[PDB]
Amino acid sequence: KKYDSTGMFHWCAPKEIEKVILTRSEAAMTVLSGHVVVCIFGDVSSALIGLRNLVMPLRASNFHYHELKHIVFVGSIEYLKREWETLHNFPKVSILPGTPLSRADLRAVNINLCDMCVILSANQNNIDDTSLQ
Amino acid sequence: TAFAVSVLDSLMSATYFNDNILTLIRTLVTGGATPELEALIAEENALR
């Protein structure tokens, strides 16, 4: 089993959340070149940004397996554990607990060698005043 | 025997007239935080 039922998207065996979690050193030993780094600003009480719709177009069937871009989600694990139920069926996906404002975490995932860095926020809707926007 | 943050406001005006006063106060109070230490703290939010 490599693709989905329609054979139009990539697929993988259900991976446990604890397997894909990487620490700063663990991300340091592995080589992340030409990958995608997604920065998530959210917590347990935030709203769900549908990260599935972010990863589905990237790993389609028209791309080769070696051509797939390793997607690393740098953000709080408290929010990310609520979204792993829709992401575990995708390959080459890793999660790094931390904050996007920490330069150590950014250096861990080799932020300098990435094709694109995505910065997203989830708790912005809850806040109302323009200053905190 | 008492200390309040309300006595530190007078720093700002002084800091405008000469930043050397603030630099001396910092290097005398915090224990000598060199700018290299400041950069290292700003990098990893810890001490190595």
Binding site: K1, Y3, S5, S61, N62 | -
Partner: protein, 48 residues
């Protein structure tokens, strides 16, 4: 998931969007040619 089927493998065939560069490769001669239409026609005729 799904198993290997010729229908799925046929479904795999699509057009992917990407971004090529004019510095080196077969289009380097047209990098400063000043005819974007000629480059488009050549790319469509040769590599579709």
């Amino acid at each position: 998931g799904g198993y290997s089927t010729p229908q799925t493998l046929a479904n795999r065939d699509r057009c992917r969007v990407a971004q090529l560069a004019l510095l080196d490769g077969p289009f380097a001669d047209l990098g400063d040619g000043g005819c974007y239409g000629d480059l488009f026609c050549k790319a469509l005729k040769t590599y579709n």
